[PDB]
Structure formats: C-alpha cells, structure tokens
Write a structure and sequence with these properties.
Blueprint: E1 7-14, E2 19-26, H1 33-51, H2 59-65, E3 71-73, H3 76-91, H4 101-106, H5 121-128, E4 136-139, E5 142-145, H6 157-171, E6 177-181, E7 184-188, E8 197-203, E9 207-213, E10 216-221, E11 228-230, E12 233-235, E13 251-258, H7 261-286, E14 289-295, E15 300-304, H8 306-312
Antiparallel strand pairs: 1-2, 2-6, 3-5, 4-5, 6-7, 7-10, 8-9, 10-13, 11-12, 13-14, 14-15
Bound molecules: magnesium ion.
C-alpha cells in the first residue's frame, strides 16, 4: 500500500437475530461512517415497523389481523414488496409465495408458534384455504385480500434491505462498497489498491468457489452444514406452497446471483422450495445464475447453471 490513499471503512451492528456489515471506500468528499451507520439503522427500523410479523404494531400485522374481503391502506414498502413478490411468484411457477404465514404458524415455524408439532390433514386443508398470492391485490394505495391472508416478507426482506442501503450510499456519493445484511449481500466498485470485492460460496466435497462481485447481489438459502433427517426423512422449515407440508428433497443450499439482491433472496427461496431437479430446470429456463448443494450419498454434490458459468467459470 501507498501512504496517501482513500480509507476502507467498516461497521457492523445487530439485527433482530443476526448481524449486518457495511464496508465502503471513503473519499475526501464521501460521508463519515457514523452517518452511514445511522442511515443504515434508520432503514432497518422502517423495515421492522412496516414488515415484521414479530411485532404487533407492524403495518403487515395490522393487515394480517383483518378478515377476508378487506382493503386496507398500506405503506409504500409493503406494496413495493407485494408487487415484487407477485412477479417472483409468476417467474417461479408459484414456488415463491408471501402468503404462507398460516401454514408457518400451523407447523410451529412462525412468530406465534410454539413449534415442533405435526398438524393433522384437516387443519392443513383449512389453513391452505387462507393462503394464495392470487387472492392478494393492490388498489391505489390499498392492499386487498379476498381470503383471510397472512403475509410474511422474510423470503425477500434482507435482500430488499441491502438494495435500500445501497440506494442511500449511492445517493450520498459512495461508489465502492460491500453491504451484507443477515447473509444477503451485494458489492460494487473496487477497493483503493484496485482489487475487487470477493465472496466465497461453500462447495463441499470443504472447497470454496470464489467470485468477484461488481454490481451483483448474492443470496444463499440453507447452509450445507444444517441438513437433518428426522427418522430418515428430511427435516426443514421450508414448506411447499402447493402442498401444505414441508419439503422432502435433498437440496441443502442454493446460492443465487442477480443484480437485484431482492430478486436473489426471492429466487433463492424459490429454488430451495423446488429442489435439486425442478430447481435446476427453472434456473436454466429463466437464465438464473445459481449454484446448488445437493446432499447425495452421505456427502455433497455441487451443480452450477449455465448463466453462473458464463459469469464465473465452471471450476473450483
Ligand atoms: Mg430468502
């Protein structure tokens, strides 16, 4: 390194149950880091107030309490996300669904869930009748629901948060940055030496595929280290929207790379719903850059898509 050189600042903080980390290059112009730390905290406060199902005074919880047939005014975020969600649903053949909260609370995986309980085939049938993206619509500044929908934004919130933080760093003059919120992240520009921002994707055999992010967000659903079979059948908190039950298949993690970190968080969730086979086919069909970790024969196999291979090479 050189003696006179722009600084690479870093801060981190607590989330509701995890951490974020921002890193950025600060020029003489550019903003101080406590300013950004406060801009990032502000943004996270709005997300929590508008979209968290874990607090009762949230906008989404006010919407969730309402009965079938309700139209209710909602803030910009919620409508932005409902809309983004609608597209994700269409692009992923329904594997992406914001309306699973009743099946989540039924299977114990939710905010009002004691947990770890197997519900009947009757309660499942009842709860699925309170689900369905097609029943959600936007009307001016109102969100409407045709059945007693309960929304949950967790499959896309962290990614959206990353994109929002980046709009703000850009608006304040920052050019080069790596923003990570509970695992979702995006980076752009280069460090002062000229090096790029790099992430590692886990690629067990414990190999690692290293990629350079410049204008691209990454999202990883699952972690190959958490793969459980309860009684020789797979245990997970991921539900098929179409069937009421949890997923049976062997996909242990999937990583998506897209310019919109919101989209990566979403498609990532959808691919893990779909599994190793339907996952790959969709990803290839729609041209998604993705890297799958499939648990095969007491070990792991990895598979990358075509779009991923053009962006990053095939090797490791
Ligand atoms: Mg997600």
């Amino acid at each position: 390194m050189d003696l006179f050189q722009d600084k690479v600042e870093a801060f981190t903080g607590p989330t509701m149950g995890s951490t974020y980390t921002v890193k950025y290059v600060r020029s003489g112009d550019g903003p101080a880091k406590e300013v950004l730390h406060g801009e990032v905290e502000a943004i996270l406060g709005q997300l929590d107030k508008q979209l968290s199902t874990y607090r009762s005074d949230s906008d989404v919880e006010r919407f969730n309490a309402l009965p079938a047939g309700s139209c209710e005014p909602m803030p910009d975020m919620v409508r932005e996300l409902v809309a983004a969600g609608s597209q994700l649903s269409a692009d992923s053949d329904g594997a992406f669904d914001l309306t699973l909260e009743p099946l989540l609370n039924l299977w114990g995986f939710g905010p009002q869930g004691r947990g770890e309980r197997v519900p009947s085939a009757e309660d499942i049938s009842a709860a699925r009748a309170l689900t369905g993206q097609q029943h959600l619509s936007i009307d001016g500044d109102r969100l409407c629901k045709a059945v007693a929908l309960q929304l949950d934004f967790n499959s896309i919130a962290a990614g959206y948060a990353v994109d929002l933080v980046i709009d703000r760093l850009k608006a304040l003059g920052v050019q080069s940055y790596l923003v990570e919120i509970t695992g979702e992240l995006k980076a752009e520009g280069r460090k002062p030496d000229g090096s790029p921002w790099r992430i590692a994707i886990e690629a067990p055999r414990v190999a690692q595929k290293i990629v350079e992010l410049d204008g691209m967000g990454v999202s990883t659903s699952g972690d190959y280290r958490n793969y459980f079979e309860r009684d020789g059948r797979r245990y997970s908190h991921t539900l098929d929207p179409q069937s009421g039950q949890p997923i049976e298949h062997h996909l242990a993690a999937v990583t998506v790379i897209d310019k919109s970190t919101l989209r990566a968080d979403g498609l990532s969730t959808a691919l893990m719903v779909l599994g190793p086979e339907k996952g790959l086919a969709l990803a290839e069909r729609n041209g998604i850059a993705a890297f799958f970790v499939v648990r095969e024969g007491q070990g792991f196999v990895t598979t990358s898509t075509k779009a991923f291979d053009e962006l990053f090479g095939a090797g490791v």
